[PDB]
Amino acid sequence: GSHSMRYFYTAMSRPGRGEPRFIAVGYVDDTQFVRFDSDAASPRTEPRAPWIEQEGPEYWDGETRNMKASAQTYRENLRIALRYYNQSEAGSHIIQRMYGCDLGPDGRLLRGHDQSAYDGKDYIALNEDLSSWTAADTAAQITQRKWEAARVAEQLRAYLEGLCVEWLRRYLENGKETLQRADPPKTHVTHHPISDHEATLRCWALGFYPAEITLTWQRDGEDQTQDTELVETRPAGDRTFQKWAAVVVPSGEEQRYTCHVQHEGLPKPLTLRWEPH
Amino acid sequence: IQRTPKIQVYSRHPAENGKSNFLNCYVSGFHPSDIEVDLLKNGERIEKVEHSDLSFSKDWSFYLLYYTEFTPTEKDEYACRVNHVTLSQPKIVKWDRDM
Amino acid sequence: QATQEVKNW
């Protein structure tokens, strides 16, 4: 339907164990297509999806050049963060950044993102207007002033407006056969007794793409939100995802429950019940 | 500042004994990044296991998937074992075909 | 394609 591209950077310090480590991944929708690891024997921006491999020498040199610079830049940001927070050089800390572009179904730029975090909490984010920043604490304000002073926001907006949208349209074309096809889930309901009096019903969704899905348990048409146990949508390893929801029900009540599945691949949501044979 | 990982042990395709499959361990929602995961058969680690590149979710917690090629058997019991700064002891999650 | 940084915190 609507498509997006995101980049994820992670920087970790390892005091006394080696240099800080930098890892970058790129995705289009839920499909990872590139990787960089500063710890690789010979660090390189490598393909992780087949359709990206067509990209030329200028491209691959360009991104390896870029990612190695970024790793240096975040090694220094990690040091700077120590000043702002007055933290010791013995601790291990983590900086993260996620940024990308959303394209509306229409295909023009619909939204742009940039968010950064320190030790897993919000640090600074590019606002929706792509011109201003939101600082999480007084330390991030120090960065905020430097960045409006250096007009970074104008530079990242130039990226998301243009180069991000342009490559992501190019990728969507190259990866047409996988990126632009929705795989509906395969669904079935499972039963396991806990005891003679109670059993667990579990609703399964398998082999779907994209990852976005909703699973719901209802009893006599009313939501068992509070009593449903949900697991995080998980990768199958073949680029499709899985999920399940389960409830513990009194024996003999199994057919009052119905499992409802919503997925972009589905024409109409599915309603499932336990069917033993 | 620290979030413990959520572990799932599952197979790529529904299990049928003697038919080749993939064994997945997916760990998610954890912070910091330093984590170790091994896949176990009868309590001993499988030699060749690969993992996805590190990435994170909207709430900044990380996720990885550890996988290996395998063939399930009636006899054998498989598991996933995870170590993290939040775990007092390595936590072992046994594979259940039902989940 | 990724974004060139090169801003420092």
Residue numbers in the entry:
A (entry chain A): 1 to 277
B (entry chain B): 1 to 99
C (entry chain E): 1 to 9
What does the paper say about this structure?
All three structures are in a very similar crystal lattice and have two independent molecules in one asymmetric unit.
The most interesting feature of these three QW9/HLA-B*5801 complex structures is that the conformation of the middle portion of the bound peptide appears varied, even between the two independent molecules in the same crystal structure. Note that in Fig. D and E, the densities of QW9-E5D-1 and QW9-S3T-1 are too weak to assign the long floppy side chain of K7. But their main chain conformations are in convex shape, indicating that the flexible side chain of K7 should point outwards. Comparing QW9wt/HLA-B*5801 with QW9-S3T/HLA-B*5801, this “extra” methyl group does not seem to affect the overall conformation of QW9/HLA-B*5801. In other words, from a structural point of view, this “extra” methyl group in S3T mutation does not seem to affect peptide presentation. To sum up, we may have provided a structural rationale as to why the naturally occurring E5D and S3T mutations would not be expected to significantly alter presentation and recognition of epitope QW9 presented by HLA-B*5801.
